[PDB]
Coordinates of C-alpha atoms and ligand atoms in Angstrom, one line a residue:
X1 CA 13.2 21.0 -10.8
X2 CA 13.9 16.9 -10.8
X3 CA 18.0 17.7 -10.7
X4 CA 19.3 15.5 -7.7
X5 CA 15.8 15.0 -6.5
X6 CA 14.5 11.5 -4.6
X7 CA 11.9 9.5 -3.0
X8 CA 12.4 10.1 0.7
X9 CA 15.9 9.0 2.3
X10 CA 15.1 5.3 3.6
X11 CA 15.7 3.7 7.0
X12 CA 19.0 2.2 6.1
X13 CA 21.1 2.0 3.2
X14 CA 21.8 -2.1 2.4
X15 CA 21.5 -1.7 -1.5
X16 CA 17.9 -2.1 -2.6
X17 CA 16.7 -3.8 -6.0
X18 CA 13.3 -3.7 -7.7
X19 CA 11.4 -5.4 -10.6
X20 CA 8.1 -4.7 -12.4
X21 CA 6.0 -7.9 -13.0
X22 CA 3.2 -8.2 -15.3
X23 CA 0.9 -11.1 -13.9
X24 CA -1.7 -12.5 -15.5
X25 CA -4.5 -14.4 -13.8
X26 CA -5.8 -16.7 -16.8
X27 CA -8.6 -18.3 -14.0
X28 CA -10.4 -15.1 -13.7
X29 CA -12.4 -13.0 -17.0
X30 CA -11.6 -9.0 -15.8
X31 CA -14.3 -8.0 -13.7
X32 CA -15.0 -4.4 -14.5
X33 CA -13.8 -4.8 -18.4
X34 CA -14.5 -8.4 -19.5
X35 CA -13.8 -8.2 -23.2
X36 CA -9.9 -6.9 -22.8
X37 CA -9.7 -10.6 -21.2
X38 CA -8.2 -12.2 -18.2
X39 CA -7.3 -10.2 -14.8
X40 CA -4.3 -8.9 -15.4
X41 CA -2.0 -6.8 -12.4
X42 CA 1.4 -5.0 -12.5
X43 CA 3.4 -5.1 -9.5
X44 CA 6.5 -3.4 -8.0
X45 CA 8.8 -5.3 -6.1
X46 CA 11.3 -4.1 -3.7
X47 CA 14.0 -6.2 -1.9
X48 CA 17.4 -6.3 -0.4
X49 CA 19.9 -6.8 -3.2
X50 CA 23.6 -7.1 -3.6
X51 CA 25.6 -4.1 -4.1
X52 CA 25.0 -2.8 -7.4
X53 CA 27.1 0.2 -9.1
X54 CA 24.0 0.9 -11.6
X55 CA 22.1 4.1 -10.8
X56 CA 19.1 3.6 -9.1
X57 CA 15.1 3.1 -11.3
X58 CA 13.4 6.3 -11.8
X59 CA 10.0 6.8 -9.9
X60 CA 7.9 6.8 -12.4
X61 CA 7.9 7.1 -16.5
X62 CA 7.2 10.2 -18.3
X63 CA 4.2 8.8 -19.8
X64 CA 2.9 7.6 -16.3
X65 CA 3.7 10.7 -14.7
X66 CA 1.6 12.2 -17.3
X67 CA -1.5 10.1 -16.5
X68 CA -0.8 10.7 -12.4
X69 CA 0.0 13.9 -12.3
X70 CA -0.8 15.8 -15.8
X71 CA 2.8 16.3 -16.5
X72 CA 6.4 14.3 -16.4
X73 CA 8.3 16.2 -13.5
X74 CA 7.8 12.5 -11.7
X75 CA 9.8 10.7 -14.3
X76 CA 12.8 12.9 -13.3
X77 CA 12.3 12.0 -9.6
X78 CA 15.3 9.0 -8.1
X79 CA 14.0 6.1 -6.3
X80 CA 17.0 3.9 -4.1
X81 CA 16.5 0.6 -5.6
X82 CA 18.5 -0.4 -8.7
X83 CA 16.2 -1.8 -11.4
X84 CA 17.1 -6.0 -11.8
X85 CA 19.8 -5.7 -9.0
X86 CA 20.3 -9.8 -7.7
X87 CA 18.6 -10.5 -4.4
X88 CA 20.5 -10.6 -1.3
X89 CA 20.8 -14.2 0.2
X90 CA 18.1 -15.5 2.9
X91 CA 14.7 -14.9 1.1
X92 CA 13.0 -12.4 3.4
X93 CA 9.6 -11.9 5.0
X94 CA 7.1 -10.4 2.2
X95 CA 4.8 -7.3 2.4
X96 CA 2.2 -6.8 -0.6
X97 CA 0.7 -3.2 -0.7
X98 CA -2.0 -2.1 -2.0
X99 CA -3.0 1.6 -3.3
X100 CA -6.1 3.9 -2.7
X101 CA -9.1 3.4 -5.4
X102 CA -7.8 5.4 -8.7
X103 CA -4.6 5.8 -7.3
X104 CA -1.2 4.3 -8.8
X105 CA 0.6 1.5 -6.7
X106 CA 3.7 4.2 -7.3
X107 CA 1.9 6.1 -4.1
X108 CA 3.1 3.5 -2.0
X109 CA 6.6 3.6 -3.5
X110 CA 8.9 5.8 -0.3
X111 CA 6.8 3.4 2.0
X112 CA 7.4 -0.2 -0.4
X113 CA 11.3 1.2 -0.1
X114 CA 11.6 2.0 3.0
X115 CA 10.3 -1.7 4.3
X116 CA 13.0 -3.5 1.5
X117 CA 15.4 -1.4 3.3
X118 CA 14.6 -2.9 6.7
X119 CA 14.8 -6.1 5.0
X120 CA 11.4 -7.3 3.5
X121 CA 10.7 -8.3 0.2
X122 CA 7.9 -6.1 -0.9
X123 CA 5.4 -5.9 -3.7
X124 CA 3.2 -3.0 -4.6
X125 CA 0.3 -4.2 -6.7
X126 CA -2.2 -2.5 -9.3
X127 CA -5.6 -3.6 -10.1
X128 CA -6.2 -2.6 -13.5
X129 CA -8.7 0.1 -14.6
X130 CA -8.8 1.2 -10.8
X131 CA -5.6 3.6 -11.7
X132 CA -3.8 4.6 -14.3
X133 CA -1.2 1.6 -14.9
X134 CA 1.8 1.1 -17.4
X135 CA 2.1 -2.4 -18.9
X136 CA 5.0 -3.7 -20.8
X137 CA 5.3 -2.6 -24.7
X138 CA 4.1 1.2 -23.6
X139 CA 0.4 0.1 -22.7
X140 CA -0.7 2.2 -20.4
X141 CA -4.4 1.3 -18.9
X142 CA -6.8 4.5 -17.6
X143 CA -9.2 4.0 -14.5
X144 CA -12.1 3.8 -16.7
X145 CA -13.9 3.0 -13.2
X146 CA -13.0 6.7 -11.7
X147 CA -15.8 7.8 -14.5
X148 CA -18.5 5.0 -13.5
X149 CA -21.2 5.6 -11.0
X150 CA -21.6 1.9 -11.2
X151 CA -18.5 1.4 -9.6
X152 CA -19.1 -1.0 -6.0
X153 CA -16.5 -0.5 -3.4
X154 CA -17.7 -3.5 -2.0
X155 CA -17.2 -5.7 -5.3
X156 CA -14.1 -3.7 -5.4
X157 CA -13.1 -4.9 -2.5
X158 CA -14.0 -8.6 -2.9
X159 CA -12.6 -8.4 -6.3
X160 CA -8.8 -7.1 -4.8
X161 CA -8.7 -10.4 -2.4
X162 CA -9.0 -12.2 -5.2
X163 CA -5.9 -9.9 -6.4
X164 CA -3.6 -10.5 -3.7
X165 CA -4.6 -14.2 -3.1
X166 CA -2.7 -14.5 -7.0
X167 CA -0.3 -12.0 -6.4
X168 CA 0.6 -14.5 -3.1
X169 CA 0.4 -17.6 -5.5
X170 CA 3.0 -16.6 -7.6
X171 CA 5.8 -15.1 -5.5
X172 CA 5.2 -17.8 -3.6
X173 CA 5.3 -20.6 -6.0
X174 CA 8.1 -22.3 -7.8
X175 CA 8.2 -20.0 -11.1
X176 CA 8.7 -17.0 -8.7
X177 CA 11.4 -13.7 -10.0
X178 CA 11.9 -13.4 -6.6
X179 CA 12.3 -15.9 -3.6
X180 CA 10.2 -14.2 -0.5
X181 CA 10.0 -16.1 3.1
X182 CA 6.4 -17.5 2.3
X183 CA 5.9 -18.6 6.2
X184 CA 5.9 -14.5 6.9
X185 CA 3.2 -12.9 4.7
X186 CA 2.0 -9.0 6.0
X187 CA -0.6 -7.1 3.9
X188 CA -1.0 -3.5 4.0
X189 CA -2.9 -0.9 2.0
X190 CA -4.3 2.7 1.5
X191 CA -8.0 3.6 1.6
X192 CA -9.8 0.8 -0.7
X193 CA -6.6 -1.4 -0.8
X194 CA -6.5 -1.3 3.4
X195 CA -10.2 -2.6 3.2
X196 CA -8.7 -5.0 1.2
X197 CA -5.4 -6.1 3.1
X198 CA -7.6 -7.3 5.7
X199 CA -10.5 -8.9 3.5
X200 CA -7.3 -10.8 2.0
X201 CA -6.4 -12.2 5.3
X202 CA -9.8 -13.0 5.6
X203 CA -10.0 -15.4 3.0
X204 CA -6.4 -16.2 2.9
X205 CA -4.6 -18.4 5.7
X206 CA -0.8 -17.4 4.4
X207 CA -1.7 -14.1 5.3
X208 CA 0.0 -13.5 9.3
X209 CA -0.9 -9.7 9.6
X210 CA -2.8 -6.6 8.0
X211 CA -2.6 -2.7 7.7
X212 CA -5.8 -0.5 7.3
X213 CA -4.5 3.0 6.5
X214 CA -7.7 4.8 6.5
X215 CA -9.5 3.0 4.4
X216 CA -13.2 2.5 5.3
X217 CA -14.6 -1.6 5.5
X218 CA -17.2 -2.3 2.4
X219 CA -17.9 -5.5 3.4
X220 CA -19.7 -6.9 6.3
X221 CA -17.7 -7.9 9.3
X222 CA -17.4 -11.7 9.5
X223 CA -20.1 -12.9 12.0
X224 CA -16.8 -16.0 12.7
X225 CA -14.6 -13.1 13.5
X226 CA -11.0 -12.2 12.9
X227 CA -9.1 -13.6 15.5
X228 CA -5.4 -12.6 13.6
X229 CA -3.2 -8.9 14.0
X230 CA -5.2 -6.0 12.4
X231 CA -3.5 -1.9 13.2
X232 CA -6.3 0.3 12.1
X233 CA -4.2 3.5 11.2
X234 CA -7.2 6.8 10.2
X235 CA -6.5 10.0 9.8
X236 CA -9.4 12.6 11.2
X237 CA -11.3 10.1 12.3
X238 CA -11.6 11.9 15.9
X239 CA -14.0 14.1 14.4
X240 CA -16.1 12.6 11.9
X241 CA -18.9 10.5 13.2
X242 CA -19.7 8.4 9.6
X243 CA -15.9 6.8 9.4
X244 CA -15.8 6.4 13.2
X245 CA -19.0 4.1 13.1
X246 CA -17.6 2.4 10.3
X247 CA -14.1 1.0 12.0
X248 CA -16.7 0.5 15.1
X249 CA -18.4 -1.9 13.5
X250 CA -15.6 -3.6 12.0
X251 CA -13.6 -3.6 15.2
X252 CA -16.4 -5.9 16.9
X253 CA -15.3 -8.8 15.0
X254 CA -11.8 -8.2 15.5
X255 CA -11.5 -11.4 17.9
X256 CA -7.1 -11.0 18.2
X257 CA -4.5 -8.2 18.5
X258 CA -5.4 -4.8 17.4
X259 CA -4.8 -1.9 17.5
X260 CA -6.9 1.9 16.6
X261 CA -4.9 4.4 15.9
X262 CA -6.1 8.4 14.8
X263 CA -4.0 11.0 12.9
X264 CA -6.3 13.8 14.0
X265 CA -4.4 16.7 11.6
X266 CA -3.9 14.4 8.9
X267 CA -5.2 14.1 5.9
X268 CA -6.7 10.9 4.1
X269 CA -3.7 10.8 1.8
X270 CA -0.9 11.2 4.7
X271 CA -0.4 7.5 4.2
X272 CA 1.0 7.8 0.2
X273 CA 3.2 9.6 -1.3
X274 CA 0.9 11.7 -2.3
X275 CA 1.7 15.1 0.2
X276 CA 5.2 14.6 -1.1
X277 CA 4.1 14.6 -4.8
X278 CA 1.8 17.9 -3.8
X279 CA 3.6 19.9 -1.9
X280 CA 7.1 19.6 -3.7
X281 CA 5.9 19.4 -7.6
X282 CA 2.0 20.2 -7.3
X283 CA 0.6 22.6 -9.6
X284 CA -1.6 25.9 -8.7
X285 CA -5.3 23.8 -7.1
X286 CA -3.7 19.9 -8.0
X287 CA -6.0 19.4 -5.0
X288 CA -8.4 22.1 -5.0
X289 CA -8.6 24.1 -1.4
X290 CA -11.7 23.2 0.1
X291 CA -10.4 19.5 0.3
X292 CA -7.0 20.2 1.4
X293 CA -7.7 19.7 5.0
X294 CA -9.8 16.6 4.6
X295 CA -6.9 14.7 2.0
X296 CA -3.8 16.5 3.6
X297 CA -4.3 18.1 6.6
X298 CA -1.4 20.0 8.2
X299 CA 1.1 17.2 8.4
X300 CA 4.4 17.7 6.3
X301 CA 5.3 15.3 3.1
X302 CA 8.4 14.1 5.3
X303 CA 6.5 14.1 8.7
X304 CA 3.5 12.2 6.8
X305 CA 6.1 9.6 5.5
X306 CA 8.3 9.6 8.5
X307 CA 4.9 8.6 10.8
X308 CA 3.6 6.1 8.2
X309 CA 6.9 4.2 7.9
X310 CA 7.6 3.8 11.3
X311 CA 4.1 2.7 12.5
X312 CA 3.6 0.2 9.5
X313 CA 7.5 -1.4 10.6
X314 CA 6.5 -1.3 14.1
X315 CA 3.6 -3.5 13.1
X316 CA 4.7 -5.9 10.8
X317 CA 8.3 -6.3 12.9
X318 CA 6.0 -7.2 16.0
X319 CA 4.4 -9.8 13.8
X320 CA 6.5 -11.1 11.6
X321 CA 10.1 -10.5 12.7
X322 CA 9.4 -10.8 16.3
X323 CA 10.5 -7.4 17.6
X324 CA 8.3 -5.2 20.0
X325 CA 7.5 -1.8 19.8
X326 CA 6.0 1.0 22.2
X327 CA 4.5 2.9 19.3
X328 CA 1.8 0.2 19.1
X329 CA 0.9 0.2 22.5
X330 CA 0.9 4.2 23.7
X331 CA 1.4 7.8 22.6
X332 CA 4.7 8.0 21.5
X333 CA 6.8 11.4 22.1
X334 CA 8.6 11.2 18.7
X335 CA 5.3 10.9 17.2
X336 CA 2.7 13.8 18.6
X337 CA 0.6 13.7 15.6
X338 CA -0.4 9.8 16.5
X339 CA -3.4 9.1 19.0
X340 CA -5.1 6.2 20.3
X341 CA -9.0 5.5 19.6
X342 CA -8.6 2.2 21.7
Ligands
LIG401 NA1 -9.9 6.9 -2.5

């Protein structure tokens, strides 16, 4: 089933290395779970590395894959980076990713790979008890907010600027485990977390440039504007008049470059790994058959990963790397499944 079996083949193949980092922000009590403490995160980093003749980190460990899935066939699954590998020389532009709500930052792993690979240092980041998250010494954390009602998405959303903003502090800082290009900062993230990439640059001048992969605003638009680079990236959003509104409103008080872009067939999850996960090791209903359209649509795990790659590389290369692309700017031949709202 798992024998030979990896992550999506990335755009190149300089050698890759990751590292898991358990942060801990001792300024901030946990919003959602006070009494377990301060705001703690995990966070995956990927980055260009020196050759390294180790095999590569697993996707995922069996326990995890457990909580994720509801079994360990994930744990047997190869990623392409090598698990402490030394960095490569010139610290590199960073990306920080952020998941959908109740969704492990392990969804954004063939996407947090595939950047690395490019040449970014990259850091996919979990907000605790908004997924099911490994910590060090076997703790593994539930999204004990997936049951509440009381949930805000706005809070939520306020609440994972706050996030980033520390996650930005320390791999920027001088105590850093890996040395990132802080004068090129990109933000991108799926659903909840893409509300959040650009509420981060909000609030955050080190931020140069944000994703929103399909993630609806929960917060009011700033009546100042947002005069820096936003790519709005939806799936379906063509036909549903509720999210449509929604990016309307926020794309008023975009005040710089931007970008609207529709996947009209896909599915709110096209941006993750999660077709991948579902069509190749999905049980019998693992997303029950009246949603399938709405969460996967009919675009392919590889076509899904393939158009979310190049799009979120096109935009962060035009913004921080200084290379232009004509898939920003009109429908792109290679790409039939992408359209243009604006
Ligand atoms: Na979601």
């Amino acid at each position: 089933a798992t024998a030979g079996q990896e992550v999506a083949a990335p755009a190149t193949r300089i050698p890759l290395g990751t590292k898991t980092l358990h942060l801990v922000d001792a300024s901030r009590q946990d919003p959602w779970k006070p009494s377990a403490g301060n705001r703690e995160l995990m966070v995956t980093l990927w980055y260009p590395s020196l050759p390294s003749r180790e095999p590569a980190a697993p996707y995922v460990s069996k326990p995890l894959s457990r909580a994720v899935l509801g079994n360990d066939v994930l744990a047997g699954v190869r990623t392409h980076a090598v698990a402490g590998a030394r960095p490569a020389p010139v610290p590199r532009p960073l990306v920080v990713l952020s998941p959908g709500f109740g969704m492990s930052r392990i969804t954004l792993t063939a996407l947090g790979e595939d950047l690395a690979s490019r040449g970014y240092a990259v850091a996919a980041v979990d907000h605790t008890y908004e997924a099911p998250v490994e910590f060090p010494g076997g703790r593994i954390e539930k999204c004990t907010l997936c049951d509440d009602s009381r949930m805000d998405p706005g809070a939520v959303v306020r609440n994972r600027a706050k996030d980033l903003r520390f996650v930005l502090d320390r791999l920027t800082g001088p105590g850093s485990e890996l040395r990132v290009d802080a004068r090129r900062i990109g933000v991108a993230g799926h659903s909840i977390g893409g509300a959040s990439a650009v509420e981060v640059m909000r609030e955050d001048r080190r931020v140069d440039a944000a994703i929103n992969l399909d993630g609806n605003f929960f917060t009011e638009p700033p009546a100042e504007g947002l005069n820096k680079p936003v790519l709005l990236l939806g799936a379906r959003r063509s036909g549903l008049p509720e999210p449509q509104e929604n990016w309307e409103r926020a794309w008023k008080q975009l005040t710089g470059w931007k970008r609207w872009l529709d996947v009209p067939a896909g599915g709110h999850m096209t941006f993750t790994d999660v077709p991948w996960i579902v069509d190749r090791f999905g049980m019998p209903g693992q997303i029950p058959p009246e949603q399938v359209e709405g969460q996967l649509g009919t675009v392919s795990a590889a076509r899904a990963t393939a158009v979310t790659r190049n799009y979120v590389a096109a935009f962060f290369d035009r913004h921080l790397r200084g290379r232009p692309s004509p898939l920003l700017d009109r429908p792109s031949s290679a790409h039939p499944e992408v359209t243009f709202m604006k």
